[PDB]
C-alpha cells in the first residue's frame, strides 16, 4: 500500500491511498501487459474467527462473496479547522493504517505538533486481536514500564506506516512532511 497527498494553488485537496495489498501483490504480471496483480482477496475473512495476514478477523459481514468488495482499512483523511481544509494525510500499513492516521490527527490537534513533528513521532498500536500493545522504538523505558504495570502487553516491533501529509495554513501557506520510515520519499512544492 502507498499513500500520497496533494493540494493545489486554489486550495483543492486530494488524498489517495491505493495498493496491490502486500508488497508486489501476488507478484504475478498479467500476461504481456506488464501489470502486477493484487492479492486483495486476503482482506476478506476466509473463515469466521481465523485471522488474515494482518491479524484481522471477521464473520458474515466481510465473508467472501461474488462481486463483493473486501473490507479495507485504508484511510485517506482530511481534517478541517475553522471551516478550511487543514490537514491532508493517510498511510499504508494494513490493519495499522487506522491507528497511524489516528495518531497523526491526535498529534496535530491535541499535542499541537507541526506536520513534520507529528510525522517523525513514534507510533504505538493495539488491534484487539492479537492482544498486544505494539510499539516502535522511541518511547521512554519509564513510560513502557508504567504501561506494562497497567496490564498492557507491550511488544517492540518494526516501524509502522508511511505518512505523506500536508498541513494548510489559514493564509494559504502549505506545510508538508514525508515519513522518515520510507527511504527515497519526498514532499515538494512551489
Amino acid at each position: 500500500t502507498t499513500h500520497y497527498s496533494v493540494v493545489d494553488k486554489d486550495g483543492n485537496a486530494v488524498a489517495v491511498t491505493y495498493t496491490l495489498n502486500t508488497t508486489f501483490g501476488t507478484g504475478i504480471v498479467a500476461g504481456e501487459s506488464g501489470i502486477l496483480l493484487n492479492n486483495q482477496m486476503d482482506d476478506f475473512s476466509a473463515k469466521p474467527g481465523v485471522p488474515n495476514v494482518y491479524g484481522l478477523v471477521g464473520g458474515d459481514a466481510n465473508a467472501v462473496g461474488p462481486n463483493k468488495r473486501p473490507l479495507s482499512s485504508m484511510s485517506p483523511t482530511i481534517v478541517v479547522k475553522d471551516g478550511k481544509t487543514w490537514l491532508v494525510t493517510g498511510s499504508p500499513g494494513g490493519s495499522r493504517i487506522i491507528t497511524t492516521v489516528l495518531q497523526m490527527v491526535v498529534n496535530s490537534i491535541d499535542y499541537g505538533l507541526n506536520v513534520a513533528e507529528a510525522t517523525n513521532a513514534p507510533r504505538f498500536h493495539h488491534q484487539w486481536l492479537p492482544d498486544e500493545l505494539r510499539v516502535e522504538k522511541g518511547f521512554s523505558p519509564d513510560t513502557l514500564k508504567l504501561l506494562e504495570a497497567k496490564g498492557q502487553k507491550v511488544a517492540l516491533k518494526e516501524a509502522m506506516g508511511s505518512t505523506q501529509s500536508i498541513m494548510v495554513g489559514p493564509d494559504g501557506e502549505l506545510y508538508g512532511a514525508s515519513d522518515p520510515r520510507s527511504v527515497d520519499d519526498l514532499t515538494a512544492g512551489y
Partner: protein
C-alpha cells in the same frame, strides 16, 4: 484543544514549505511528476491522477494499475467526496474458496495464487475522478508515467531493497514477472535501469483509448487469459462489469475539528471517528504525547473499535453497516466510561458492542 503549530525555527523537525502547490508521496520521481502537473496548470485531481499513474511505474511495490484503492477529494469550496475504486471479487468467487480440504484457510491461495486477485479498480477510479473533478485529458496525466516506463528510470535504495526482500518471494516464480524485475539471475540492484516496455504499451493504449482499454480492451484480454490459463477467476465479464463508485465520506467532529475519511467498503473512516469520539472524553492535551496515560487511553479505545470492526464492517452494497451507531457520541461515551487509566482490560473480556440503544 490547544493552539496549533505550523512549525517554527526552534523545532527539531521542519516541514517543507510552499506558497502555491504541494505533493507528498513515497517516491521522489512521482512527487516531482505531481508538482510538474500543478505547475502546468492542472488542479489537485489532475496531479493526483498523474502521481497515481507514475507510482504504478516507479513504485511497483504498491503503486499500480492492477490493484485498487480510495480517494478523498475536497474542493476549495468545501465539497468533500470519496471515490471507492476497491477491487470486486470475481463473479465466480465463493465463500469457502480459500479453505483447504480440511476446511482450514490456505494463505497461499489468498496471497500468492491466481485466486488471490480481485478485479482491479485503479484505472476506473482515476478516470471517474479525472472526468468529473479534473481538468486535463487522460493522455496528458498518463504521459509522465508512460515515458518512465518506456525510457526507464534508475533503481533507488527503496526499490532495490524491496525487490530483494519482498520481491524474491514471488517475482521470480512467474516468467513474465521475472523477465521484468530480475536481471542476471538476481533482483535489479541500485543503480540499474528499470525499463518496462509492456507496461509502457499498456499505458499508451489507456492514454489513447481511455479506461475502456483496461476493462474491455487488450489489457482486459491479457488479464483474462492470465487467469484462464492459471486457475484464476477474473473473466472479461468481471472486468466489463467493474465500476468505481462515488460515495459519501464518513465524518465526525473532534473538539471542533471536522474529520473526513473513507466510508465502507473501508473501515478506516468509521473507526477513526469512533476512536476520536472516545478520546474526546479525555483531556488528551493534559496527558501529552508519549505519556503512559495517553497511550493507555488510546490502546483501550482501539480495542473496542477493532472488536466492532470484526463484526459490523463489510461492503455496504451487500451488508447494512451500522455506521450511525458506531460513530454515535453516546456509544463512544459508554466505551470511554469503561476505560480505566490504571488498568487495561484483556481483549478476552471485550466483544463487539451492543448497538441497539444507539440505532
Amino acid at each position: 484543544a490547544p493552539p496549533v503549530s505550523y512549525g517554527v525555527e526552534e523545532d527539531v523537525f521542519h516541514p517543507v514549505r510552499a506558497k502555491q502547490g504541494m505533493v507528498a508521496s513515497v517516491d521522489a520521481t512521482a512527487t516531482q511528476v505531481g508538482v510538474d502537473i500543478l505547475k502546468e496548470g492542472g488542479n489537485a485531481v489532475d496531479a493526483a491522477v498523474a502521481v497515481g499513474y507514475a507510482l504504478a511505474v516507479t513504485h511497483p511495490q504498491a503503486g499500480n494499475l492492477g490493484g485498487g484503492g480510495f480517494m478523498l477529494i475536497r474542493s476549495k469550496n468545501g465539497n468533500t467526496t470519496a471515490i471507492d475504486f476497491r477491487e470486486m471479487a470475481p463473479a465466480k468467487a465463493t465463500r469457502d474458496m480459500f479453505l483447504d480440504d480440511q476446511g482450514n484457510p490456505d494463505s497461499k491461495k489468498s496471497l500468492t495464487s491466481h485466486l488471490a486477485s480481485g478485479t482491479p479498480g485503479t484505472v476506473a477510479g482515476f478516470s471517474l475522478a479525472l472526468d468529473k473533478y479534473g481538468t486535463m485529458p487522460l493522455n496528458k496525466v498518463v504521459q509522465p508515467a508512460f515515458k518512465l516506463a518506456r525510457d526507464g528510470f534508475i533503481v533507488n535504495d527503496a526499490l532495490a531493497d524491496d525487490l530483494k526482500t519482498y520481491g524474491s518471494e514471488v517475482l521470480p516464480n512467474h516468467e513474465n514477472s521475472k523477465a521484468i524485475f530480475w536481471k542476471e539471475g538476481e533482483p535489479l540492484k541500485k543503480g540499474d535501469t528499470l525499463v518496462q516496455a509492456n507496461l509502457a504499451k499498456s499505458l499508451e493504449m489507456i492514454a489513447e483509448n481511455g479506461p475502456d482499454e483496461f476493462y474491455k480492451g487488450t489489457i482486459a484480454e491479457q488479464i483474462a487469459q492470465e487467469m484462464q490459463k492459471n486457475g484464476g477467476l477474473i473473466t472479461k465479464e468481471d472486468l466489463a462489469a467493474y465500476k468505481a463508485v462515488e460515495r459519501t465520506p464518513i465524518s465526525g467532529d473532534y473538539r471542533g475539528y471536522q474529520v473526513y475519511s473513507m466510508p465502507p467498503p473501508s473501515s478506516g473512516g468509521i473507526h477513526i471517528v469512533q476512536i476520536l469520539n472516545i478520546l474526546e472524553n479525555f483531556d488528551m492535551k493534559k496527558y501529552g504525547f508519549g505519556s503512559a496515560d495517553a497511550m493507555q487511553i488510546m490502546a483501550e479505545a482501539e480495542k473496542y473499535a477493532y472488536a466492532d470492526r470484526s463484526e459490523y464492517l463489510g461492503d455496504p452494497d451487500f451488508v447494512k453497516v451500522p455506521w450511525q451507531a458506531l460513530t454515535n457520541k453516546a456509544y463512544a461515551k459508554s466505551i470511554a466510561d469503561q476505560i480505566d487509566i490504571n488498568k487495561a482490560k484483556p481483549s478476552s473480556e471485550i466483544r463487539p458492542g451492543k448497538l441497539a440503544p444507539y440505532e
